[PDB]
């Protein structure tokens, strides 16, 4: 139509439509008026130049008005004048910086000074929670943000299709020297190489893999060889058990385990010319192994065994207890007079569990 201040005939799209009063005003009488009231008047004078029909003398409409006017102000006037608007807003209205929100959906930034925990972006008109910034659904009403996100994650189809492979990766691998973490299952090669420190360690027990002639453990018999030392409940040893025997240790302690899905999709890192690339495990997924391969299904069972601090020595036979005694106590056991195999077994078990604790660096949950 025409500008409401000076009457200059313009198309509607070449003026500023004041949100409050819907008066059309050219860029020059917009920029001039609001720049002046900033540099020569007080913030309550920043009404519409045509009508003054923002009733800015009651704190009811005061904050909503400026939150919207800030949008048209930012676009039409120049920096130090727009910064003067924020100063006088802080010093005259808010007594603090205005709360500026960034819309996660459309990248727009806007001042939000209202009570509600959900905010509508003035650009995309989509509403989000002001704390977690996720899209607002009524499921979030009356619920904490963690409740809400823990809800969306446990309802996304692509997350549940991944099955137990997600559980194995959220079981991270933390390098015990540089404390770098990896969202990797421990896979089938316990010898891990961390990248920032080059430190070599077992991903199941976090014990060091010693180079040649570097192992300080007493009575070690492979000191001239690359190796590490593992507790009896580390995946390095427990991966040699059948899934049946690992399930037997769990069942004897009433620990549940999956056998069906809730090739193998466990994510691994392959070295390509430009970095690392996620190659899904892809190995066979046998029946009763809950969608994983045997290797990753055993890692999943050892995960539950370690999380509950279950002791595999409770299932050791005499031969296993004797091997464990030579390995961790550094003495060859010997039966005593009057002992039968059960009493000999019970004695070796007591001494072992009393003297050699389970893995002291194994992650347990």
């Amino acid at each position, epitope marked *: 139509q025409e500008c409401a201040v000076c009457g200059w005939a313009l198309p509607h799209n070449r003026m500023q439509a004041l949100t409050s009063c819907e008066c059309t005003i050219c860029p020059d009488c917009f920029r001039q008026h609001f720049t002046i009231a900033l540099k020569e008047k007080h913030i309550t004078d920043m009404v519409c130049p045509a009508c003054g029909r923002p009733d800015l003398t009651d704190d009811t409409q005061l904050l909503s008005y400026f939150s919207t006017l800030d949008i048209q102000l930012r676009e039409s006037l120049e920096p130090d004048a727009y910064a003067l608007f924020h*100063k006088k807003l*802080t010093e005259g209205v808010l007594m603090r*910086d205005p709360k*500026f929100l960034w819309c996660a959906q*459309c*990248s*727009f930034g806007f001042i939000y000074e209202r009570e509600q925990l959900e905010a509508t972006c003035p650009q995309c008109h989509q509403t989000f929670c002001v704390r977690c910034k996720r899209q607002w659904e009524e499921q979030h009403r009356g619920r904490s943000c963690e409740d809400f996100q823990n809800w969306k994650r446990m309802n996304d189809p692509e997350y549940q299709a991944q099955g137990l492979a997600m559980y194995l990766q959220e079981n991270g691998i933390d390098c015990p020297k*540089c404390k770098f973490s990896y969202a990797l299952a421990r896979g089938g090669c316990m010898h891990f190489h961390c990248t920032q420190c080059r430190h070599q360690f077992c991903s199941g027990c976090y014990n060091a893999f010693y180079a040649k002639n570097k192992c300080p453990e007493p009575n070690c018999r492979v000191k001239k060889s690359l190796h590490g030392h593992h507790p009896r409940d580390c995946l390095f040893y427990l991966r040699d058990w059948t899934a049946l025997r690992l399930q037997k240790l769990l069942q004897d302690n009433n620990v549940m385990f999956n056998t069906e899905p809730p090739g193998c999709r466990v994510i691994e890192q392959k070295e390509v010319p430009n970095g690392l690339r996620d190659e899904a495990c892809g190995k066979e997924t046998p029946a009763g192994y809950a969608g994983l391969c045997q290797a990753h299904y055993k890692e999943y069972l050892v995960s539950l065994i370690n999380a509950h601090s279950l002791d595999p020595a409770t299932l050791y036979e005499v031969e296993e207890l004797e091997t464990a005694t030579e390995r961790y106590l550094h003495v060859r056991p010997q039966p005593l007079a009057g002992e039968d195999p059960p009493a000999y077994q019970a004695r070796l078990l007591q001494k072992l569990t009393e003297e050699v604790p389970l893995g002291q660096s194994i992650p347990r949950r």
Partner: nanobody
Amino acid sequence: EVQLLESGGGLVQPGGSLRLSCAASGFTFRGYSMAWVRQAPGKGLEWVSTISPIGTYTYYADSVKGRFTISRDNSKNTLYLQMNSLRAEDTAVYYCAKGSYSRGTPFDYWGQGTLVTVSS
């Protein structure tokens, strides 16, 4: 126009502390948010922390919450970053950045950067 100069970078032992500073000029310091971003080896830029014009609000990336403290001295036009319990993963070039209110740009300029490496 805008100039931003970082200082305080160096070599730090694991678990150590370091305080970066950023001297700014060429714009109305008190009228803008200020931010820190960082470039880890082989990456681009990762947001670290933002502080409101007078410091009413401070924001931190999750990886640094509780360990880092952002602050500013508007009288000196200087921005600070107090870094505690440093880890190897905190190794990066740290950049001072001038905040902006325009859509899609929380900052429109960042400085030359100061390198911080955490040994071991």
